[PDB]
Design a protein around this ligand. Sequence first.
Ligand SMILES: Nc1ncnc2c1ncn2[C@@H]1O[C@H](COP(=O)(O)OP(=O)(O)O)[C@@H](O)[C@H]1O
Ligand SMILES: [Mg+2]
Lengths: 532, 52, 205
Amino acid sequence: PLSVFGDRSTGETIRSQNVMAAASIANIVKSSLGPVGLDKMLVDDIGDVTITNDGATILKLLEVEHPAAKVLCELADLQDKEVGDGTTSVVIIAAELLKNADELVKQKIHPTSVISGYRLACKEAVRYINENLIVNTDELGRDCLINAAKTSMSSKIIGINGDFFANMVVDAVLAIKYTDIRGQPRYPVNSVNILKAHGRSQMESMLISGYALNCVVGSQGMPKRIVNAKIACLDFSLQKTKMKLGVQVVITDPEKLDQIRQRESDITKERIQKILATGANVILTTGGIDDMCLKYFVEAGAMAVRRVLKRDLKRIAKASGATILSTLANLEGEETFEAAMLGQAEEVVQERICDDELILIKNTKARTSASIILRGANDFMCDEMERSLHDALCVVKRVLESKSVVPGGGAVEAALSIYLENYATSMGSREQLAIAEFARSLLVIPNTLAVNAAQDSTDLVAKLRAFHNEAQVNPERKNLKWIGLDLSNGKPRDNKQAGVFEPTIVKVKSLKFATEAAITILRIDDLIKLHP
Amino acid sequence: EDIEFICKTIGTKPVAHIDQFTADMLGSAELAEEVNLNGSGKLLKITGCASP
Amino acid sequence: LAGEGISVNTGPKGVINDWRRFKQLETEQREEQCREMERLIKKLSMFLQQYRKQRMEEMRQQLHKGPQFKQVFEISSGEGFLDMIDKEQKSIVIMVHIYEDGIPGTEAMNGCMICLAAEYPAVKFCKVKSSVIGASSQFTRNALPALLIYKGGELIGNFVRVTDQLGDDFFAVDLEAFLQEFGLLPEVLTSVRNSASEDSDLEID
Ligand SMILES: Nc1ncnc2c1ncn2[C@@H]1O[C@H](COP(=O)(O)OP(=O)(O)O)[C@@H](O)[C@H]1O
Ligand SMILES: [Mg+2]
């Protein structure tokens, strides 16, 4: 009849297939949630190993075929990009929402009503979180940042080492702090250059009060350390001058060839002399430096580094006050290098790190920067440390930007479930079932934590729900809103007092993204797969 | 192919030779900034133009 | 026997589904046969000499890499071969290794390709069984050493029967020089790694 070249799935078949794919994706990463979660080994059939706990990384490395599973993977990636934390919780919540919504649909509830109920439940959950479950960080102080970093780094390779890594992360984030127009203190994470190097233990990871370059001097002749550095950042190569494409040298008088060839390098000689005549000590350029220019720097006792990365050069110039010069051309058509185009640093040292060397630009003036050197046991451990450290930095940035945090350990999810279950009776007649199922699906996070802890998930979640119900029914028991889970002892615990925090933005964005993904997948009721 | 839309929006007139590049060929705008979409890329926004 | 002008008419439009179903597999095989045509029978039938630098080059190659020696990728299927030769950038040279287990003159050039991959990160040395592709009897009897070189999606080096011009237990430098004879080779040590939105840095403003 149709005569279309492909397969067709219609009705409950395609819906069940989509829910199966989402559930499989959720079960892939369900075992890596919460402090009692465990990492995963990923092998790419070539011999490369990626030990990771990040949900976004796991879903990115895996090659997936089903479109709904791809939707969940992109959801995790988007959560990672826009927040930096909660990449596993968003996927689990979205899959649970999809499963419960499909159960409702199989109960002959129209998907439009389910979608409307889900949207209303998401709005009410966000409003309730922003009205009741937020804790202002103004009165908490640096302890709030430390606790947020420790909570973020739990369930990672740097978990128990939180007492030290949280201080390190907070110091780095505060170091890279800057303010802009509209009076907003903006924290540009990814300005912290994360350098990995196996060797000593995690305790030997260093927080550089400056910047760290994964580069060395171009020649062994130059000194490896300069005290009062005058950093000169350049964006052009220092090589023998070559005529451009449109210029060709044609010789008719033999006497001029030697002069031509001499000036061919005298041009670069003069440029280097102009640069060095102002007292520059450290010269960083993105382009290459050949042997003759390297010797020019050697004789003057300078420090020349070639093939410096563009982002690294920009960060060094911004921190040290130097201006990146793509050319030595001024507004008078001349070749000049003013002294004001020089950066300043308190030291530039080429340190040795496990039979390898890197350049440390220490204590730059006019701006404070930061870099991190992660010391581990092998490359895989260093990569996992870097991923966890990036997660912690993102969490600290979120806490510092928006001054609201919420208790962790499933407390917010349980409170939301209780409130939405109570609220569903006040809206609609058929979408109330959708709101109730949204509330029930919100309970998948504490259940997953308890399951990962190998404790009595049913009884523990029942106790948590009872605590939150008592909090929401009795006006005088508002202090019970912070009751979460203590996974080590398997008992409910006041997480706000215990120091388990996370940014409100993480929960809000995860809820919104999961609701949108569930709505998107729920609309599909007929799939046509054309034959390639 | 975006020249026509840009000129209709801003009010500029294209210039192909530096000799004819004058102030009368410019398009005044209230604001022109490159906003950041919460890590999802950068959008270059020009909002507010005389003679829209 | 009349009516030779059949004009099948309605027939095809009700059966083009099955016709295209067969045609897709026919074309899928067709890429494989057309690709293997350019090698299977295209050309099957047809004291400074001491190189003192060869020894120092071998010594430098012995210290190629620290982490691991790495192994040559083993292609497991024909369509895998097709979708790796067609994939990847056309500006890179991809070298394919043709061999069968047991034939002499193989392990030496396996080790040579291992050393080349260790030294050269750009090139994409890979190996695949001769029988997996499905070469003919003549290839399996007198064409085991085959050097398949890809560049731009098309062949630029098609060496076969290289034992006479290389030897039997040749070193890495020997095959490297042999490949360099036709200009086939395109022109620091980090700690472990460096690569860690787009917000980079600002200051006060
Ligand atoms: N010390 C702790 N006690 C109880 N719960 C915690 C603790 N630390 C983290 N959690 C909870 O574990 C959950 C899982 O976090 P995790 O999976 O590590 O983050 P992500 O989802 O970004 O990978 C979080 O929702 C958090 O509330
Ligand atoms: Mg986390």
